Every structure is written in structure tokens, then in C-alpha cells.
Amino acid sequence: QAFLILCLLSAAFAPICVGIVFLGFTPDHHCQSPGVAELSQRCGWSPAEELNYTVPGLGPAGEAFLGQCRRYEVDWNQSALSCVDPLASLATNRSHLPLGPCQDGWVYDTPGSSIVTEFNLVCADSWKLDLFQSCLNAGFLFGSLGVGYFADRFGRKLCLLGTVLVNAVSGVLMAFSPNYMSMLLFRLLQGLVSKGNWMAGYTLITEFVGRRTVAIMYQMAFTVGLVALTGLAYALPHWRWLQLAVSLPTFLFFADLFRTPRLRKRTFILMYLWFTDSVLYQGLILHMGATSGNLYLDFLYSALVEIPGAFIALITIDRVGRIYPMAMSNLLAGAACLVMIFISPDLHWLNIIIMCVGRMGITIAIQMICLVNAELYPTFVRNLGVMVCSSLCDIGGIITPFIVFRLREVWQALPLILFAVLGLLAAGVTLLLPETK
Template identity: 60%
Template sequence: MRSEVALLSAAFTPIYVGIVFLGFTPDHRCQSPGVAQLSQRCGWSLAEELNYTVPGLGAADETFLHQCMQYDVDWNQTSLDCVDPLSSLGANRSHLPLSPCQHGWVYDMPGSSIVTEFNLVCAHSWMLDLFQSAVNVGFFAGAVGIGYLADRFGRKLCLLTTIFINATSGVLMAFSPNYAWMLVFRLIQGLVSKAGWLIGYILITEFVGLGYRRTVGIFYQVAFTIGLLVLAGVAYALPHWRWLQLTVTLPNFCFLLYFWCIPESPRWLISQNKNAKAMKIIKHIAKKNGKSVPASLQSLRADEEAGKKLNPSFLDLVRTPQIRKHTLILMYNW
């Protein structure tokens, strides 16, 4: 059961660090139809074409020039020859006028990324930062709200809901027609993916006793590390970002099978005055583990005899000195 839930941690990897592959920014330069025609007429190699037509090439401190600027030259004029064509316009290239890229960019990479497809470079490079900021904002909002929702409606329901929304939005992102829609679906993924990851962590720690919580927590994190290794291999095999996004998203639909594989948390059921259901699950777990039900749990009263169920509240985070200390420590860590 713990290994099944740990798969959630591995599947969370593409959302957490997928920007490394989805938003990869290769070396690029301005695209110019005139340069392409002149290069074809003169029979230049790629190195010669770059040397003759790209400003600031080879200078480490002038990366912006060769990636985002072009010579403001009419490359179709007949006075340009094939041997250092700019020499006829000035003795020093640094004095020639420059202009931003007018016809898009040429990217030095196989495949594609969201950067190359939507041209998120130069003046639009901030849009790549916004893409990652959107998922991080979703992480924050989802992590803050999911604790209350999981306490209010149950771990299992919230887990299945976040899995479905995460998988659906991930697929829709792979088919996004433009940057705006891609950003919306990425924000939705951020809202539910971190929340689902946290619910998975809660579930595996609530299924085991206090002495095993550290062990299963480490196991959950190890699964995340394995996900990193798998993601690198998949990204190498699929250099096109849409196929990569689709490939790492579709397996999430398989987690909907948890409806039949994963029971509700017995601890949550007990807190909601559903002792009969909790005891049924506890006895099943004990039978699978070859253990007997602890005496402290055998004394649980039936639902109709139990006390009032616990209603969650954000005030629970600061209700006692011990909880206040833990809350402040976790807030500081975040």
C-alpha cells in the first residue's frame, strides 16, 4: 500500500522541475530571410554565415547582441559581396546600426520547447519566468488550502479529485493553442499537484504507527528522486515539449485506480466519528500485516455511541503551544 501511494511522489517530479526541459532556452539568433538568400547565393557554410551576419558573435559579454539584435541592413542590396559583405558599409562593424529581431528567431536545437514555440526570448523572456511563477503560486495556494479540505471532506476524496484535475489540466496544456491557455492550465496544475502530493504524504503517515513515520516519509522522498531520473531519460527520448508533457501526464490517470486500492485514512474516520468504518480498515491492515489489532483500538465505541465529530479549523494551527511551535517552524521552512 505504501509503495502504491509513493508513485504519486514520482509523478509529481515533472511538474516540480519540468521547466528544465519544457522551458529549455537554446542558443538563438535573429531570423532574416535576406541573410538566408544571400547565404544560399554565396554558398556559405553555417560558420561563415554567422561570422558575416550576426553581431557580437564570440564575445562572452555580448550574448544579448547575437541573440536578440541584428544588423539594420538590407541584405538584398546588390552591393553586398560574398567575402565579408559588411565591409562595404563601414570599416568597423561596431558602428553599424542594430535593430531588434524582426522576423523571429533561429534556434540551435533539435525538437522544441515552449521557448522555441512561443518565442519566449529577448523582450519576451519574462514570460518564461511568469510560466514558472504561475505553478509556484499554485503550489502555495494549494498547499495552504488542502489541509482544511482534506480534514473536511476526507483524504481519499481530495486525493482522487486532485489527481483527476491534475491529469486533465496536464493533457490540456499539451494541446494548448497559445501561451495564455498554457499558462492557465499550468496554474491549475500547480494548485492541485502539490496538494495531491501532500495528501499522499498524509495518507502514508496515517496508515502506519508513530515509529514508522520517518521511514515511510523517507521512502516517499526517494520515490521523488527516482522520478527525477526517469524524467531525464524521458526528456532525452522526447525532445518535443508537447509529446513530453503528454507522456509524463497520462500515467496520472492510472492513479484513479486508487479508488479501489487505497482505503480512507482510519485516523480521519475516527476523527469524524466513523469508528465502524475505521475498525474495518484497521482489521484489514492488521490481517495483511499478520498482526493483531492493538488493545487501544479494540475499545473504540460504535459510531452511534461516540462523541461529537471534530470539525477542522485554521485556528487548530495555533490552538496549543506545541502546535503553535510546529506551525511557526514549518512556516519558516516554507
């Protein structure tokens, strides 16, 4: 039963970004109006009428921020008793009427209640969610550093058991976070211990079994854990429930790499390629989490289309080569992103087709570069180089939400333009690497 424990760890690594994708799914949050709600319940009692009358939806050019944070209430309550147009008592023009800030609670039209429902990160504090994911990725960086330090400090078994216990306790207590600062601290510690524990588990899986087929099986177990996480999240929406029920399964018991000019360029290229691969992966996953109204089934398809990509990679490691399939995969990802920005209102089936093609390309690129990294670097500083490249991977993970949630608010097209430019540049730059194969 050696493989079952590793598969369970892989499943426990699912909520890394999928955690904030499912938990951070922001529903249509309209700020609560005291007078309007009472009158609507008294006479209207219609969700469509309440949505149309509580907030001003007249947002030119698709701007919903004017209606996602404003009540535009003139304290009409039920005095007018029109029930067809309560806002007509003050003025006919809904947008021209003054709208004070909605500092009160927000109403989230969802049978479940995500993190935004229980923490009021509705519209004015979206950078709080961005900072949440950024703190998770900074936790990965500092946790790689701490895991290296602890491995150099005590050992490979006491550190492993300690970080596994820390991960289990951090998840369980993060399911019981009263305020936002405690949730942030627990997420930081969770990132630390999760990065360390996954690194240790992958190293043990690839070392104690003696094969790359075992690593492929580990990635497949990660995908299976992702599918199980999506299936479990669909059954129970609440974020506390999901966090508790995904943390419970875990609880069962030289630095001079820039010296050689020939090697410095290769290190720079590999760093940039992986960096942009992690950025594209997290960006597409968060985009799917923040644009789909059927996120459960869409995300299930996205997770299920990962394993044909893994099979293609396992077939093409020895067939295509080591540098040629990288450029093709990145160019395919860039073309897919361009089609996404060109086919947003064309067809949703076309949208999911392009999405799964892009995800397959990203998976191919990530697996190939993970192989190449360990393949080319010399044994003296292989770990060092892995840590150095993971540094920029964590930098990209930090940057990704702070750019996605800062550019989407002003225009929908900017994140896709940025992703396509990054992918095309990666495809055009990764072909200058020497013969890794």
C-alpha cells in the same frame, strides 16, 4: 502494490521545477534575417558562417544580448554576393552599424524545440519565463491554502480523487495549450493540485504504513522519478511531447504562533532556514539548467548524487544530531557556491564535483529541517506551523526566478554571490536553535 502508487506519484512530482529546467532550456536564439538567410542558403550553406554573419557577435566583456536580439541587416540580401563578408557592404565595423529590433521570429539551433522555440520567449521576454515559474510557486501557495480548505470542507478521499483527476486533466490539457495565457493558467492550476496531492500522498504514506524509513523510501522514489524524467526527456526533446508523456502516467484510473518570545525566535529561524534552503535548491537546479551545454548528463549526475545524500542523512539523524549537521551542511553549501564562482573557467570536472557536493549539502539540509520542523512544534499547531513555513517557502520559490533572471542578465557573478551570502548566513544563524535532539 501500495508502494508502487506512491512511487508513481513521486515520479509525477518530478516536473515541478525540473519541468521548467528541461522545457525552459533556451537554445542559442538568433533572430531571423530575411535577406541574409536566402543568400547564405544560396552560396554559403554553412551553419558556422550563418551564425557568424547573421548576428553581430562582437560583444565586449562577454555581452551576448547585443547579438541575441539584433539582426543588423541593411537589406543586402544577395546583391553584394560576397558570401565571405555580407556585412562589409554597409560598413566594416559590425557593432557600429545600426541594428533594428528583431520583432520577427527567432531561429533556434536545436534538433528539438523547447518552450522558448514554440512561444518566442527568446530574449525580450525572459521575465515571461520568470513569471511562469513564479506563477507555479504562487500556485503552490494558493493550492496549499485550497487543499486545506477542501480537506476541512468535504473529506480526505473525495478531495484526493478530485485533485488527482484535476492534476491529470491539467497536465494533459497543458500539453495542448495554444497560447501563452492558457499555458500560464494550466500551470497555476497544476501547481495548486500538485502541492495538494503531494501533501496528501506523503501524509498517507507516513500514516497508513503504521516509519521514517518509509519517508526516506518516498524521497528515493522521488529521485528515481527524477532520473526517469531526465531519461525520458533525453529521448524526446519537444516540450509538448514531454508534457503529454509525463502527464499520461498520472492518469491511470490557532494562528498566534508569534506570542512566546522564546518560540517566536525559533519560528523565525526555522522559517528563514527553510526559506533559504528552498531558494538555494531551486537556484542551483535552474543554474544547472541555464549554464550547461550537456544538461542531460549533468542533470542525470545531479539527480543521481542525491541518494548518497539521503543515505548520509538517514545515517546521521541519530548520530550527528539535530542542529549540528544543519550548520555544517549550510556552510558546505556556501563554500561550494564560493568555489563555483571562483572556478568557473578552471575545470569542468571540478565544476561538477563542486555542484554535486553542493547538491548533497542542500539535500541533507532539506531532509534534516523537514524532520526538525515536525519534531519540535507541539501537536496543537503543528499543521499551522507547517503551513506558515510553507508560506515563506512559496515566497522564496516566487522570488528565485525573479532574481536569477534579473541579475544574471547584467552579471554572471551576482546570483552566486547572493546564493553564497544566503548559505553562509544560514549556516551562521542556524546554530542558535536549542537542543532539538
